[PDB]
Amino acid sequence: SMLKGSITALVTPFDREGAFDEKAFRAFVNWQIEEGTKGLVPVGTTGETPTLSHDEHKRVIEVCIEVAAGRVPVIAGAGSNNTVEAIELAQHAEKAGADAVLVVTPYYNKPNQRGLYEHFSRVVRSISIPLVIYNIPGRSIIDMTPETMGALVRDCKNIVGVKDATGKIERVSEQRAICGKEFIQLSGEDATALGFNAHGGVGCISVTSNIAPRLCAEFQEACQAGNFAKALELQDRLMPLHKALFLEPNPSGPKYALSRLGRIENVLRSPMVTIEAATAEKIDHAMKHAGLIN
Amino acid sequence: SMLKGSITALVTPFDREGAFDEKAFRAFVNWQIEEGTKGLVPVGTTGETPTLSHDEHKRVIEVCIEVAAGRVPVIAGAGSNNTVEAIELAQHAEKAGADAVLVVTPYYNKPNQRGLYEHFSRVVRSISIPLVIYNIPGRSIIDMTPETMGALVRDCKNIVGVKDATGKIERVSEQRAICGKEFIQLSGEDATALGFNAHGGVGCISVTSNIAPRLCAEFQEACQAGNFAKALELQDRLMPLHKALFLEPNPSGPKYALSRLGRIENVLRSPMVTIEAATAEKIDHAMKHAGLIN
Amino acid sequence: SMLKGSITALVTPFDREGAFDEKAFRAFVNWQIEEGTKGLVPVGTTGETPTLSHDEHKRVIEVCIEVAAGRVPVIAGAGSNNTVEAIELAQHAEKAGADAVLVVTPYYNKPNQRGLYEHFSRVVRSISIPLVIYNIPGRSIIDMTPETMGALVRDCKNIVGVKDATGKIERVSEQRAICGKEFIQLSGEDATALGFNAHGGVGCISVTSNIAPRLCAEFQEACQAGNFAKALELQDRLMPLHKALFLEPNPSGPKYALSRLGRIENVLRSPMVTIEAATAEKIDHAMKHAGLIN
Amino acid sequence: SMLKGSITALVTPFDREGAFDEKAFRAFVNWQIEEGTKGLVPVGTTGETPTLSHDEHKRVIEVCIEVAAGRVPVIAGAGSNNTVEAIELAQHAEKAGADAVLVVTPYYNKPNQRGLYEHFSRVVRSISIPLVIYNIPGRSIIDMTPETMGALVRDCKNIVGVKDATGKIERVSEQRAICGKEFIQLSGEDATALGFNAHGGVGCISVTSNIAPRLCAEFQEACQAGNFAKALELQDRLMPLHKALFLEPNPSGPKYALSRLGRIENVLRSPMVTIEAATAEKIDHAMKHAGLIN
């Protein structure tokens, strides 16, 4: 569809006082597109949605859509562990001109499969734009089974794919069998994007592409062209950065990395915190390996 | 000191339309106190806080405090994964007349120990009433270590105890060694409340006490008196209900059980859902075993 | 029957050349009994059974029985992931004059519940002395459910009890409900022995009792008398040693500790290795806290 | 070391009395080679090594080598949680004429990284044929880190590759970075063989290839040729069988499947047991899908 390739899970930059840095964000989103990013996810996991006010949440989406200017799809984060709240966020994303919404499995309250089916069927029926399921047991603890995901694709037209952050690559095969070959599967993990694409993925909603949008865009292009030899060469270049970016909790690593490129301030909101020196040095080394700094 | 014994993690009742059933809640809170419940936690995990609006959240606390009428402590749930939001909730709980606040580890965003330290030190310094740390890796994934908990009690006077939902009983011993004997340890799990108290717990923030407040009050009294033989007799009576209540996701089991006593409607907010018939029958059997119904 | 209280999971001492140190072992088993140990398990987890030859395996059991001289029960380790091998080990233990056998859940090959039922029913029917199930998911990965345990106690006369190393104290309650109050439950973990007994345990197959047999014997006696207040005072004394002994893989910690008492050489067989200096210092400090050394 | 492609983790057939079925095994090993299997692992996890006597262990290796007749490499299973035992097994495998040995991380006794280093360095130094590390946390619980694996490749000439059963595909990238590009990485999981190869794997030590040697050989050939579109078509054909074969514990599924092809008796040694009828029907359906039976 339009949902393929390297799609950046955008950091939300803050200034030296913790306010939304709209100026850095505008320049950053433009840089991303110039470097070959195929899509943008504002206010996701990596955007520190939890610490944004309701107004900041709306504003980051609006600015993201305005700078994109139709050049690349905007898949707005619209996640909540409250079905009524996720409806409101998804409708506001659509009204604001989002191309699609990314809707996480409810976190903290740990619903069963019936509850997941109800949550996703009610959210997608509230809107007219495509919905991507965001399955991340490592943050929501519960796990949408391929069977539940199949029931939702069968029953709901606008459920078009998954951000699959299970890190269990056999799921790509099971989801392909049950949801079909047209079901849009996007890696939710940078380090396993390569194998994810071999099992039938068509892209990655990426943290690393915040830092290396061009190499990540080329890596994804290589996978979609079937040039796995080139993709593996690019994996050898990026894997140190895939690893170093996650030594500390996301998006501490990415925000340090983007500050080291001079593009944002190294600032996060409690309970997220700046990385220690030792992490910062492993991220610098990984950025040299990848050729992003001399 | 007032934080001892059986403390009910209150369900939030909804009517046949999903509105706050204030009438059922008032009668329920009163029944709980009459049956010997030693404290109340409104808008905690079992209260479906995620699906309450800001106004419903305020109202459940206000009504809880009003009905309590100083007869037992009210420990208001005041959790967020956003430090600024948790400050605002804790201050509002204090202004409303709460005796203390229960503040969960940030869920979803997975901060490190420094982030936890910052979160809890800023929340407790924003207020003048006691704070209880709520450590629940099974919902927030990350885990406040005894060491980090010790640092917070050492540095912050008004951090007075923990709701410990780790299910790892050796933590009670480690928290007692590092946080001290005066540190108030309350079981976050019904089924291991007994062993929890043997290691130095002085009570339980309980789901089962929603259904069997009097037997739960006696069980806790027996532990605090040192009559572990009586506590074990009461465990033989309560354990099938401890188990049957959690066959399906909390608080679906409890809400069915309380509807079977005629005290609420069997109604939850998406993505939480009513239990299957088979579960309902295992909860009826466990309630018969405990002598709550014929 | 006489399976109660502090039962030592004996280390197998090696000399400076890696041979079985039979002289240190005979003095150690005698010391254990003199200090009030209520039972002995030779060639278990803590005995490095995997690195003993078939002849060394037979000899450690024989020496244990010879020194015991009927003063305390010997529960010989007779564990294998091969049912035919476990039959042969249990029969050899019985012929050698063991009072009972400790038989682990098969490790590595990960059988289902039917396979566990078959394993334990065939081994216990091969012998005429009591059998204790050893349930340790932390080493064998699979987990005998309370239901499977129930089936085995119900159907096999000589299956009398469990060494429960799940660390999940709600299992003691579930096993008591299904297997009955007369079913002999022994903690498989030192740090949760206390809570284990509160839920209906009658003792602990202990690592710590290798080092502090007398304090561990008194702690267990206190629990069996219903003096949980005294048991908790003894927990305050023992918990730093419970922790320091397991900083590094069992039995590295215990073997260093027993060498520091002058009772064995600090020698293990590959792939087990001696502890680091730093660990050794945390073990010394824990031994001072407990009053075992000046 | 042309250890590449589909390498079968051979079942050990037993007759209706539980004895080694040498006649079925000879015909099976020959069939495997005729169908394009590139290598053979006798007496591995899938061969029920735990339940083989010392003489049966030697015999299955000897028959495997004799039937192979130099046509494909034989990588003999030589695993133990005892370093001295693993030495003896590896030397005997070499004396019998094995091309290489597969040596599992010690199970049950849970050594640290020093213990793993010592275990593998002593085993490989005892022999003069190549050694493949078998890293399987799902059976041994402990996990050789890429750093420990790199130390062993740096220090030990004959450590040539890994059977990687972590199911964590980012390990392939990390092992390639630290152990180098010539380090032979073989998938330890059938379901993720495809992505494993995309990250730099050159084959799979396979369970499924017991049942579909030809399709598994083609799948691996497609990956090694860089035809990932063909490999993915073959994944769509094999994945239901990759799943159905592991509904019940390995090798109960494979043994039923091979009995349904008429090639062995459906017979396992305790504690492994024949699959239920229900599983057998899901395996039949998966075998129909793959075109192995009508």
Side-chain angles (χ1 to χ4, degrees), chain A residues 1 3-15 17-33 35-156 158-181 183-280 282-294, chain B residues 1-3 5-15 17-22 24-57 59-94 96-156 158-287 289-293, chain C residues 1 3 5-15 17-57 59-281 283-294, chain D residues 1 3 5-15 17-87 89-94 96-156 158-213 215-294:
Chain A
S1 90
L3 313 180
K4 54 163 108 50
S6 184
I7 298 164
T8 300
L10 292 168
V11 301
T12 305
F14 308 124
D15 67 17
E17 294 89 335
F20 176 42
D21 190 342
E22 183 178 312
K23 174 217 269 227
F25 184 64
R26 283 178 182 286
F28 171 63
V29 170
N30 194 73
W31 178 63
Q32 281 283 316
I33 294 169
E35 291 290 286
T37 291
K38 294 302 181 307
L40 308 162
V41 176
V43 293
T45 309
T46 301
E48 284 172 83
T49 323
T51 54
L52 298 184
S53 72
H54 182 89
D55 192 61
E56 283 167 341
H57 182 112
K58 295 229 202 136
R59 183 70 179 156
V60 176
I61 292 158
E62 282 167 11
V63 169
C64 188
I65 285 155
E66 178 195 324
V67 178
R71 288 181 287 170
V72 294
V74 178
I75 305 96
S80 182
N81 59 1
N82 175 358
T83 304
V84 167
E85 183 168 48
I87 285 169
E88 160 137 22
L89 292 172
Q91 288 175 344
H92 280 77
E94 173 161 6
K95 157 171 190 219
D99 294 294
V101 294
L102 179 71
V103 175
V104 73
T105 57
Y107 42 88
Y108 190 83
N109 48 11
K110 299 168 71 182
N112 54 30
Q113 296 303 302
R114 304 186 298 291
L116 288 183
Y117 179 86
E118 186 190 340
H119 181 78
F120 282 91
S121 56
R122 293 180 54 189
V123 175
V124 72
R125 277 156 189 178
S126 81
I127 53 177
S128 278
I129 53 165
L131 184 146
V132 181
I133 300 160
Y134 178 14
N135 197 25
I136 183 159
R139 293 185 182 270
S140 297
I141 294 181
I142 48 71
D143 190 352
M144 182 184 294
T145 61
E147 290 81 18
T148 300
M149 201 175 291
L152 284 165
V153 166
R154 182 200 52 220
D155 294 344
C156 309
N158 284 325
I159 303 191
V160 299
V162 59
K163 191 188 167 193
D164 177 358
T166 60
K168 297 166 159 197
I169 303 312
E170 70 274 16
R171 288 298 184 78
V172 178
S173 303
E174 293 168 348
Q175 287 155 180
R176 167 180 167 95
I178 297 171
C179 298
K181 296 194 247 225
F183 190 64
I184 298 161
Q185 304 199 54
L186 303 171
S187 180
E189 303 297 341
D190 276 289
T192 57
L194 177 49
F196 194 96
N197 282 346
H199 286 238
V202 293
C204 176
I205 297 174
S206 172
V207 175
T208 312
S209 66
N210 281 275
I211 313 307
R214 191 189 263 110
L215 287 171
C216 292
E218 284 169 349
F219 168 78
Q220 283 296 335
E221 282 166 14
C223 293
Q224 274 91 70
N227 195 339
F228 280 95
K230 178 64 168 184
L232 177 60
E233 172 190 330
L234 296 189
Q235 186 81 0
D236 293 335
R237 201 151 164 204
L238 279 174
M239 182 65 211
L241 191 66
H242 293 336
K243 205 185 53 224
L245 284 187
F246 293 91
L247 295 174
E248 288 203 44
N250 187 43
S252 291
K255 280 189 150 183
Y256 165 76
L258 195 52
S259 82
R260 176 64 182 75
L261 289 188
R263 289 187 189 278
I264 70 163
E265 293 291 12
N266 185 16
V267 178
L268 291 101
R269 289 186 186 172
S270 187
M272 306 322 291
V273 296
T274 57
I275 63 168
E276 322 261 41
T279 322
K282 286 274 174 71
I283 293 187
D284 292 354
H285 265 79
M287 281 171 86
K288 281 156 173 321
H289 187 81
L292 306 178
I293 53 171
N294 347 80
Chain B
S1 115
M2 36 153 50
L3 309 183
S6 180
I7 296 161
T8 299
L10 293 162
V11 301
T12 306
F14 307 124
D15 65 20
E17 284 109 324
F20 178 38
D21 188 345
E22 183 171 326
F25 184 63
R26 284 183 185 269
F28 170 63
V29 166
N30 192 74
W31 176 64
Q32 281 282 316
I33 295 169
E34 313 240 60
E35 293 291 283
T37 290
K38 293 302 185 306
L40 308 162
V41 174
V43 294
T45 307
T46 297
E48 287 175 81
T49 320
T51 55
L52 302 183
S53 68
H54 290 293
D55 289 354
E56 285 167 339
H57 186 290
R59 187 69 182 150
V60 176
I61 292 170
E62 280 170 34
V63 169
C64 194
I65 288 160
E66 182 194 314
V67 176
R71 287 176 288 167
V72 295
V74 179
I75 304 100
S80 182
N81 58 2
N82 173 3
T83 305
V84 174
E85 181 172 50
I87 285 170
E88 204 170 356
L89 292 171
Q91 281 173 348
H92 171 276
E94 174 169 356
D99 297 285
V101 296
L102 181 69
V103 175
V104 70
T105 57
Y107 42 88
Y108 193 76
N109 48 10
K110 282 160 37 106
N112 50 32
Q113 299 300 303
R114 307 194 301 289
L116 291 183
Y117 179 87
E118 183 186 349
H119 180 79
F120 281 93
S121 58
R122 292 177 52 186
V123 172
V124 72
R125 278 158 186 169
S126 81
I127 53 171
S128 65
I129 56 159
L131 186 146
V132 181
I133 300 168
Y134 179 11
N135 197 31
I136 183 158
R139 294 184 183 277
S140 298
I141 293 161
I142 48 70
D143 187 356
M144 184 184 296
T145 61
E147 291 76 24
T148 306
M149 203 173 293
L152 283 162
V153 291
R154 203 165 48 63
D155 294 339
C156 308
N158 279 321
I159 306 179
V160 297
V162 59
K163 189 186 170 196
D164 179 1
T166 59
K168 299 165 163 186
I169 306 308
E170 72 273 19
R171 290 291 182 89
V172 179
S173 297
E174 295 165 350
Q175 286 157 179
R176 177 184 167 85
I178 297 159
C179 301
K181 295 191 183 156
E182 102 188 295
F183 191 65
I184 297 166
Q185 305 201 54
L186 304 168
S187 182
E189 302 299 342
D190 274 291
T192 57
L194 175 51
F196 192 97
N197 284 346
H199 285 237
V202 296
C204 178
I205 297 172
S206 171
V207 175
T208 311
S209 67
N210 282 273
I211 312 307
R214 185 210 263 105
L215 292 176
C216 288
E218 287 175 34
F219 167 78
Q220 282 296 333
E221 282 166 11
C223 294
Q224 274 96 65
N227 194 345
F228 278 95
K230 179 66 174 175
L232 180 59
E233 169 188 331
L234 287 177
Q235 188 81 354
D236 295 335
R237 269 182 93 179
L238 280 175
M239 182 64 213
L241 190 66
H242 294 333
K243 201 186 198 310
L245 284 188
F246 292 99
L247 288 177
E248 289 194 45
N250 191 38
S252 65
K255 276 193 150 177
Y256 165 77
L258 195 52
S259 82
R260 178 63 182 75
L261 290 189
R263 291 184 186 282
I264 70 166
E265 311 279 347
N266 185 16
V267 297
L268 292 102
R269 283 189 193 171
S270 180
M272 305 323 291
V273 296
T274 58
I275 60 168
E276 293 286 349
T279 313
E281 205 262 300
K282 287 173 185 76
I283 291 182
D284 293 350
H285 257 80
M287 282 169 89
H289 186 80
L292 308 175
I293 52 163
Chain C
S1 343
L3 303 185
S6 177
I7 297 167
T8 300
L10 295 163
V11 300
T12 305
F14 304 123
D15 65 21
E17 292 83 357
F20 177 37
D21 187 344
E22 184 170 314
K23 294 171 167 201
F25 186 62
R26 63 204 205 196
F28 169 64
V29 167
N30 181 58
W31 176 63
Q32 282 283 315
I33 295 167
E34 161 226 305
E35 292 290 293
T37 294
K38 296 301 185 298
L40 307 164
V41 176
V43 293
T45 302
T46 298
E48 282 176 82
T49 321
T51 53
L52 302 182
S53 70
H54 296 278
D55 292 327
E56 284 167 340
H57 185 109
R59 187 66 183 160
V60 177
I61 293 165
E62 274 167 24
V63 168
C64 191
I65 287 157
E66 270 175 3
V67 176
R71 289 175 289 168
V72 294
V74 177
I75 305 101
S80 183
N81 58 0
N82 173 357
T83 304
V84 176
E85 185 169 81
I87 287 166
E88 283 168 18
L89 290 172
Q91 287 178 339
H92 294 26
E94 176 168 46
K95 204 212 202 58
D99 297 285
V101 295
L102 182 67
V103 178
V104 69
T105 45
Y107 43 88
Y108 190 80
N109 49 7
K110 292 166 79 175
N112 52 29
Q113 299 302 302
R114 306 188 299 288
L116 292 181
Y117 180 87
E118 189 193 342
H119 183 77
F120 283 91
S121 58
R122 295 180 53 195
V123 169
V124 71
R125 278 156 203 249
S126 80
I127 53 176
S128 298
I129 54 168
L131 186 143
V132 182
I133 299 163
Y134 181 11
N135 195 30
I136 183 158
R139 294 185 183 272
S140 298
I141 297 169
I142 49 70
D143 187 358
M144 180 188 294
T145 61
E147 293 77 16
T148 301
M149 203 169 290
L152 284 161
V153 303
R154 208 152 64 225
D155 298 344
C156 304
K157 57 172 279 159
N158 291 339
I159 299 185
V160 294
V162 60
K163 188 187 171 192
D164 179 5
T166 57
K168 295 183 181 164
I169 301 305
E170 73 275 16
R171 290 299 182 82
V172 176
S173 293
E174 295 163 3
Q175 287 161 174
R176 172 192 177 79
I178 295 167
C179 300
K181 300 195 210 173
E182 283 184 288
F183 184 61
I184 298 164
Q185 309 198 53
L186 305 169
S187 179
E189 304 295 349
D190 275 290
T192 59
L194 174 52
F196 192 97
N197 284 344
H199 285 239
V202 293
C204 177
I205 297 174
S206 170
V207 177
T208 310
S209 64
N210 281 273
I211 312 307
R214 188 172 293 251
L215 283 174
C216 286
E218 289 175 36
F219 164 83
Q220 282 298 333
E221 284 163 339
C223 293
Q224 274 95 67
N227 198 344
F228 280 97
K230 176 166 181 193
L232 176 58
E233 174 190 0
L234 285 167
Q235 187 81 359
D236 295 332
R237 300 186 65 203
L238 279 170
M239 183 69 203
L241 187 68
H242 292 335
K243 215 193 161 280
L245 282 191
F246 293 99
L247 288 178
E248 291 196 42
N250 188 43
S252 289
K255 279 197 143 178
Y256 165 77
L258 196 49
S259 82
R260 178 63 182 75
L261 290 186
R263 291 187 182 278
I264 71 166
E265 295 291 328
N266 182 18
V267 179
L268 290 102
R269 285 187 186 171
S270 189
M272 302 324 289
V273 296
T274 58
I275 61 168
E276 302 288 6
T279 312
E281 199 276 319
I283 291 181
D284 293 353
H285 194 278
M287 282 167 81
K288 208 190 281 239
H289 181 81
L292 306 176
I293 54 162
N294 291 117
Chain D
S1 35
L3 302 186
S6 173
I7 296 167
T8 299
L10 295 164
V11 298
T12 305
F14 309 123
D15 66 20
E17 294 86 348
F20 176 41
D21 190 342
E22 186 180 318
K23 183 194 314 197
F25 185 64
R26 286 192 187 264
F28 172 61
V29 168
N30 192 73
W31 176 63
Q32 281 281 318
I33 294 167
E34 286 304 77
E35 292 300 306
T37 293
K38 294 299 184 305
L40 306 165
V41 174
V43 292
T45 307
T46 299
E48 284 170 87
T49 326
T51 53
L52 299 186
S53 68
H54 286 169
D55 279 2
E56 285 170 334
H57 185 108
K58 298 332 188 181
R59 183 67 179 161
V60 176
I61 290 170
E62 281 170 38
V63 170
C64 192
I65 287 157
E66 179 166 323
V67 179
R71 283 178 293 170
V72 296
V74 179
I75 305 150
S80 183
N81 60 0
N82 175 358
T83 304
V84 168
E85 183 172 60
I87 286 168
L89 292 173
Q91 284 173 346
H92 196 264
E94 164 152 27
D99 294 286
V101 293
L102 182 70
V103 177
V104 72
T105 49
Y107 42 86
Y108 191 74
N109 46 11
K110 294 168 67 185
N112 56 25
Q113 296 300 302
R114 299 185 305 289
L116 290 185
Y117 181 84
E118 187 192 345
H119 180 80
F120 280 92
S121 58
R122 294 175 60 179
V123 174
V124 72
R125 280 161 184 173
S126 80
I127 53 178
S128 55
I129 55 164
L131 183 150
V132 181
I133 300 164
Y134 179 10
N135 194 31
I136 183 160
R139 291 186 187 274
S140 301
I141 292 163
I142 46 70
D143 188 359
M144 182 186 291
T145 61
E147 289 76 20
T148 301
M149 203 175 290
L152 282 163
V153 171
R154 185 198 57 214
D155 297 345
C156 305
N158 277 313
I159 301 189
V160 296
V162 60
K163 189 185 168 195
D164 179 357
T166 59
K168 294 180 169 164
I169 301 309
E170 73 275 13
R171 288 298 179 84
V172 178
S173 302
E174 293 168 350
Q175 287 155 178
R176 170 181 171 91
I178 296 160
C179 294
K181 294 193 176 114
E182 259 166 61
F183 189 67
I184 304 165
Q185 310 197 51
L186 300 171
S187 179
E189 305 293 341
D190 278 287
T192 56
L194 173 50
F196 192 97
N197 283 348
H199 285 240
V202 295
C204 176
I205 297 173
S206 171
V207 177
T208 313
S209 64
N210 283 275
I211 310 307
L215 285 178
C216 286
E218 283 172 1
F219 166 80
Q220 282 297 331
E221 282 165 5
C223 294
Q224 275 93 68
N227 192 344
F228 282 94
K230 179 66 175 179
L232 174 60
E233 164 160 318
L234 286 178
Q235 185 83 356
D236 294 336
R237 206 168 162 174
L238 282 174
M239 183 67 211
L241 188 67
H242 292 334
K243 201 190 180 267
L245 286 182
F246 299 89
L247 292 173
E248 289 195 41
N250 192 38
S252 64
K255 280 195 147 183
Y256 164 76
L258 196 50
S259 83
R260 178 62 183 82
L261 291 190
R263 293 190 181 273
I264 71 166
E265 298 285 12
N266 182 16
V267 177
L268 293 102
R269 284 183 193 178
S270 190
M272 305 325 291
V273 292
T274 56
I275 58 165
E276 296 294 356
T279 313
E281 296 156 7
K282 291 175 181 86
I283 292 185
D284 291 352
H285 173 83
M287 281 171 85
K288 288 168 185 332
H289 184 80
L292 303 180
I293 51 155
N294 300 324

